[PDB]
């Protein structure tokens, strides 16, 4: 499946999420069993090709949610609920970023910005 690996590398060059890339590969190949191709296998194939993500997928999705609720607070400043949960998710992503810095997957030089 060298052509499949080339297509996976081309999709990874398009800035797609590894889970989204695996879902697209399963949809294109018609994989009835999800155990054959998984996100861990996609990450292993990307490491074999030499591509590793800059940020974790969960941290990226949390940052996207934080950006969305920040845009909502910019639209509506009178709301208390979105501000409170923004404080909560910033606490959560700060804890996860500290865990990632200790695990050294995320470089310790990079710091989360509010």
């Amino acid at each position: 499946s060298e052509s499949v690996i080339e297509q996976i590398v081309k999709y990874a060059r398009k800035g797609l999420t590894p889970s989204q890339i695996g879902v697209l590969l399963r949809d294109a190949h018609g994989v009835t069993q999800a155990r054959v191709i998984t996100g861990n296998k996609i990450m292993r194939i990307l490491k074999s090709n030499g591509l590793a993500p800059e940020i974790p997928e969960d941290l990226y999705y949390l940052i996207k949610k934080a950006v969305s609720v920040r845009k909502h607070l910019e639209r509506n400043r009178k709301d208390k609920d979105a501000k409170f949960r923004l404080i909560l998710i910033e606490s959560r992503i700060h804890r996860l970023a500290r865990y990632y810095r200790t695990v050294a997957v995320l470089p310790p030089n990079w710091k989360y910005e509010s």
Binding site: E2, I5, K41, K47, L51, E54, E57, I63, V103
Partner: protein, 193 residues
């Protein structure tokens, strides 16, 4: 209402994809029949698959279809009773159907490319952060992609974890893990088991 709108959009996208697929398929088999008539000899399925891959990479249109016909005119692509007669014609029709099935398999190989082309056409009709990958050192780890796909995800995780293959870690630990994992006896035992 949102569910109905999403279902309608999905149905429209599926119909557009089906129309693009059948247009590509019938033009491609017409070009293949024309090339078979011009050459006068049977064409291998591997050469047809290579030509289909080249056409998919070329992003073929009608002018690019003429260009593909010209490339087929080049030497590289050119080199690549009555009841019994009716049965032979039926066998030839079955061979043509097998060639069409090979063309459909090639289109399924480029189904990601076809979906990308359909999405580009939809974006052109509409006329309207990011995730980045850092560079890392490649390691094949002695296993091919087909060999990895022929093994379970649990066995691959047990053999080598994602944390053990951390890209932003020290190189000495990665070298030690590679040296401990590249044993020929362990690989032979895993292959035999």
């Amino acid at each position: 209402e949102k569910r109905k709108i999403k279902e309608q959009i999905k149905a429209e996208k599926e119909t557009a994809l089906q129309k693009k697929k059948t247009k590509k398929l019938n033009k491609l088999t017409d070009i293949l029949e024309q090339l078979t008539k011009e050459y006068g000899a049977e064409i291998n399925a591997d050469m047809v698959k290579k030509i289909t891959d080249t056409l998919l990479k070329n992003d073929f249109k009608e002018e690019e279809w003429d260009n593909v016909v010209a490339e087929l005119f080049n030497e590289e692509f050119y080199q690549q009773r009555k009841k019994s007669k009716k049965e032979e014609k039926l066998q030839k029709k079955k061979e043509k159907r097998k060639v069409n099935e090979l063309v459909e398999n090639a289109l399924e190989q480029n189904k990601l490319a076809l979906i990308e082309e359909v999405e580009k056409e939809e974006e052109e009709r509409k006329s309207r952060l990011k995730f980045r990958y850092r560079e890392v050192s490649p390691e094949s780890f002695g296993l091919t992609a087909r060999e990895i796909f022929a093994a379970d995800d649990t066995d691959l995780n047990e053999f080598i974890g994602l944390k053990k293959f951390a890209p932003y870690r020290s190189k000495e630990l990665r070298a030690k893990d590679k040296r401990k994992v590249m044993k020929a006896r362990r690989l032979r035992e895993w292959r035999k088991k």
